[PDB]
Amino acid sequence: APDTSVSNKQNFSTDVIYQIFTDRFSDGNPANNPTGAAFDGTCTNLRLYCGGDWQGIINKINDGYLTGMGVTAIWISQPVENIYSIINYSGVNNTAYHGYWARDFKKTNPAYGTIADFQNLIAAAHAKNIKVIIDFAPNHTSPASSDQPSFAENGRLYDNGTLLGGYTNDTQNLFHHNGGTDFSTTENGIYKNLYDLADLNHNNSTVDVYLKDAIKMWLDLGIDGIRMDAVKHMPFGWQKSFMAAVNNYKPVFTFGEWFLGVNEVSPENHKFANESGMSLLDFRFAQKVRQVFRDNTDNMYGLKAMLEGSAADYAQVDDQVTFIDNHDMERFHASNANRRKLEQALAFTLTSRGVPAIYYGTEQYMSGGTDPDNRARIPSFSTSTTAYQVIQKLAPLRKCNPAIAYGSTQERWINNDVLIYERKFGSNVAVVAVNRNLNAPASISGLVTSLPQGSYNDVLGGLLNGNTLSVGSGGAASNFTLAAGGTAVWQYTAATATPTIGHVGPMMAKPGVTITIDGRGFGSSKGTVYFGTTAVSGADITSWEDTQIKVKIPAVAGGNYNIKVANAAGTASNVYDNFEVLSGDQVSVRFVVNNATTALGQNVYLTGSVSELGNWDPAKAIGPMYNQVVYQYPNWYYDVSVPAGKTIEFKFLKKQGSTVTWEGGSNHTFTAPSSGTATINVNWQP
Ligand SMILES: OC[C@H]1O[C@H](O[C@H]2[C@H](O)[C@@H](O)[C@@H](O[C@H]3[C@H](O)[C@@H](O)[C@@H](O[C@H]4[C@H](O)[C@@H](O)[C@@H](O)O[C@@H]4CO)O[C@@H]3CO)O[C@@H]2CO)[C@H](O)[C@@H](O)[C@@H]1O
Ligand SMILES: OC[C@H]1O[C@H](O[C@H]2[C@H](O)[C@@H](O)[C@@H](O)O[C@@H]2CO)[C@H](O)[C@@H](O)[C@@H]1O
Ligand SMILES: OC[C@H]1O[C@H](O[C@H]2[C@H](O)[C@@H](O)[C@@H](O)O[C@@H]2CO)[C@H](O)[C@@H](O)[C@@H]1O
Numbered sequence: 001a002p003d004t005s006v007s008n009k010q011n012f013s014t015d016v017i018y019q020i021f022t023d024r025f026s027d028g029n030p031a032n033n034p035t036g037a038a039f040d041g042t043c044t045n046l047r048l049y050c051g052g053d054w055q056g057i058i059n060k061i062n063d064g065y066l067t068g069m070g071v072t073a074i075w076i077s078q079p080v081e082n083i084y085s086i087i088n089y090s091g092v093n094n095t096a097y098h099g100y101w102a103r104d105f106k107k108t109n110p111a112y113g114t115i116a117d118f119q120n121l122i123a124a125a126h127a128k129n130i131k132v133i134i135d136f137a138p139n140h141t142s143p144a145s146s147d148q149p150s151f152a153e154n155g156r157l158y159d160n161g162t163l164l165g166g167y168t169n170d171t172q173n174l175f176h177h178n179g180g181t182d183f184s185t186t187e188n189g190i191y192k193n194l195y196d197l198a199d200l201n202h203n204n205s206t207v208d209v210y211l212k213d214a215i216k217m218w219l220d221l222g223i224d225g226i227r228m229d230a231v232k233h234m235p236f237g238w239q240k241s242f243m244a245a246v247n248n249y250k251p252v253f254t255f256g257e258w259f260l261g262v263n264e265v266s267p268e269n270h271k272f273a274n275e276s277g278m279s280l281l282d283f284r285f286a287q288k289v290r291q292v293f294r295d296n297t298d299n300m301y302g303l304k305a306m307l308e309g310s311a312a313d314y315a316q317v318d319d320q321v322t323f324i325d326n327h328d329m330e331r332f333h334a335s336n337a338n339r340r341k342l343e344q345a346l347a348f349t350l351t352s353r354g355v356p357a358i359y360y361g362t363e364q365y366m367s368g369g370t371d372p373d374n375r376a377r378i379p380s381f382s383t384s385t386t387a388y389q390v391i392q393k394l395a396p397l398r399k400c401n402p403a404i405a406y407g408s409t410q411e412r413w414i415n416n417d418v419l420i421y422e423r424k425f426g427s428n429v430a431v432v433a434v435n436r437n438l439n440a441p442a443s444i445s446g447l448v449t450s451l452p453q454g455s456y457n458d459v460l461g462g463l464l465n466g467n468t469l470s471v472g473s474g475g476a477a478s479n480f481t482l483a484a485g486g487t488a489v490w491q492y493t494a495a496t497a498t499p500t501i502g503h504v505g506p507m508m509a510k511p512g513v514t515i516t517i518d519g520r521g522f523g524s525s526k527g528t529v530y531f532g533t534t535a536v537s538g539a540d541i542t543s544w545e546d547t548q549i550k551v552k553i554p555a556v557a558g559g560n561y562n563i564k565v566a567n568a569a570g571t572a573s574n575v576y577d578n579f580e581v582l583s584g585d586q587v588s589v590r591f592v593v594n595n596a597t598t599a600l601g602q603n604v605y606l607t608g609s610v611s612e613l614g615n616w617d618p619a620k621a622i623g624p625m626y627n628q629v630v631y632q633y634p635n636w637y638y639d640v641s642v643p644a645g646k647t648i649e650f651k652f653l654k655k656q657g658s659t660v661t662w663e664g665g666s667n668h669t670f671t672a673p674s675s676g677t678a679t680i681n682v683n684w685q686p
């Protein structure tokens with residue numbers, strides 16, 4: 001099936017996500033509405049239940065509200081069973097309408113619907129070529145207090161009705177007991193409570209395995225994607241082990257939430273996206289897009305810098321989920337502002353690299369402050385709005401223009417208020433022009449594109465004051481005027497003859513697993529897939545076609561491989577890099593090293609006899625290690641994803657820049673658990 005098919009649970013670059021706050025969408029079944037001080041059918045008290053449900057979603061998917069827009073994917077609130085208790089935060093009643101207060105990951109939220117309802121949601125959606133993504137919060141349970149076990153539900157965690165444990169009198173040690181985080185450091189925000197939410201301890205085999213079993217359930221229920229919540233609050237190593245659990249069973253596009261603020265650029269965030277095995281929500285993109293189009297605290301030059309930079313920082317920039325606003329920030333549209341800003345940002349997002357995601361109600365010009373004002377009920381299902389139309393015209397492009405989906409980005413013209421960029425993939429091209437300046441037109445001369453000779457009509461049909469473009473020879477465009485607040489989209493598509501790889505997923509897995517390779521010019525006959533120098537052909541290639549290839553991962557050694565393909569004729573494609581071949585099934589292990597003294601600016605890393613440990617390469621060593629919460633300096637620790645049941649030789653090192661200092665004596669040894677977790681305590685050898 002084409003790379004565009006709804007069945008492609010491995011690629012979302014051609015889709016348009018629609019983020020839905022289930023409760024605030026549509027009440028298709030009032031019989032499941034909560035009651036009492038937890039319910040409010042008017043939806044004035046934004047901290048209560050409003051009635052929104054899966055049934056409602058189905059109806060909207062059925063009357064054409066979503067399909068009409070061009071939406072091809074929906075991200076819904078956490079489906080699992082949340083607490084029932086109505087919490088009181090200073091005279092104000094709060095409920096788990098949001099779904100981020102997990103009680104039992106093996107059951108659904110009655111308010112949203114039954115398992116049967118969820119199954120109906122999947123079918124209705126699938127039938128309408130719409131993919132389903134679900135929010136998942138394995139970082140915690142609910143708001144708790146060890147002192148007052150009467151507070152809410154003591155963060156109680158169940159396993160399909162069976163009570164595992166609570167926050168108070170936590171003998172099993174399921175949760176963390178290190179206080180709350182101040183967001184001071186990564187390690188601080190990972191091992192301490194996020195707010196007052198009962199932090200789960202992933203180092204406990206019970207929790208580990210449990211969450212592993214849970215996710216399978218949902219996977220078996222037909223989901224198409226996963227949205228990992230609070231990923232910067234969970235151990236990277238564990239997450240890696242969790243991802244492999246997914247990829248080694250039922251691969252699905254996964255992206256986590258790594259909150260970033262204005263002008264914030266984290267390297268820890270980059271490395272996560274590149275090694276974790278999952279992608280992330282483009283906060284970088286979102287924040288900059290806001291300064292530029294919203295608050296006007298930066299200009300086009302800042303927009304260009306972001307694009308270029310990101311493309312260099314992320315190994316797979318096209319896997320990043322872009323957005324302009326969400327349930328955690330003020331709605332992009334201000335009650336007094338010009339709507340043209342919101343439309344512009346929308347156009348920009350839809351035609352940019354990554355995976356566009358739209359927070360429900362945007363198309364309706366919903367204004368609102370922070371939580372919970374940004375979570376109002378969808379006021380209307382009108383397709384007459386300008387925003388609704390923009391989405392409607394541009395959305396489909398991601399499907400018919402590989403340039404938009406997998407294309408590169410290039411500034412072709414720029415200035416303080418104007419930005420013209422070129423998306424390009426194979427014989428496909430897209431050129432977009434934006435003029436934020438709402439009061440001044442811009443004269444565009446010297447514009448050069450990759451557009452074939454001829455005239456081009458604005459894809460937006462002048463909806464946003466766009467215009468016609470005249471491209472002479474050499475891609476040189478004729479002089480034109482870019483109206484105030486103008487936005488134009490010109491394009492050119494053609495059949496690609498050369499094999500061009502645009503996507504690959506999953507991005508991490510063990511031998512035997514089937515991976516998906518999408519692109520153009522693959523031909524109709526089976527060819528060859530190269531995993532490094534290892535060639536693959538024949539039966540192992542489950543399926544081959546012009547835009548997609550399904551091939552089983554060869555039994556090569558664990559490590560990082562380069563993926564290339566060649567058609568029947570023998571013509572080779574571009575080289576897709578950064579694919580990780582796991583050594584086998586994964587298990588999360590905690591490494592601890594005692595008496596490891598360092599100098600200010602010098603850190604301790606780990607290395608070993610397996611690819612998951614860098615293979616003895618100081619440049620690929622795990623770290624830097626932690627030393628301040630679970631263990632204090634000179635005692636370091638770290639949660640690492642290693643191959644289960646394997647015998648590993650390891651060592652630690654102190655790294656100062658590129659300068660490496662090896663541990664002395666012989667190599668440490670240990671045999672990884674064939675399931676669940678373990679802790680390795682060792683002393684530094686001099
Ligand atoms: O060549 C292939 C070999 O691969 C495997 O060797 C591993 C070792 O088992 C690891 O210990 C590590 O080697 C480090 C080593 O930890 C460290 O001691 C250091 O050795 C220094 C030594 O301290 C110092 O006295 C002096 O002699 O210089 C040495 C450095 O050359 O440095 C090693 C890294 O250079 O990694 C290697 C692989 O690189 C495998 O076990 C072997 O069987 C195999 O030969
Ligand atoms: O002509 C090629 C040239 O085009 C663009 O330059 C624009 C520039 O962005 C405008 O601000 C203004 O100065 O007119 C120029 C037209 O020459 C590209 O920015 C540039 O890379 C490229 O060389
Ligand atoms: O907390 C992380 C921190 O660890 C190391 O700092 C050590 C330092 O090396 C010791 O000499 C002593 O001062 O304790 C510190 C731990 O608080 C790294 O050197 C440093 O880069 C890193 O921030």
Ligand SMILES: [Ca+2]
Nearest residue numbers: 029033051053
């Ligand atoms: Ca309902």
Ligand SMILES: [Ca+2]
Nearest residue numbers: 190199233234
């Ligand atoms: Ca945590």
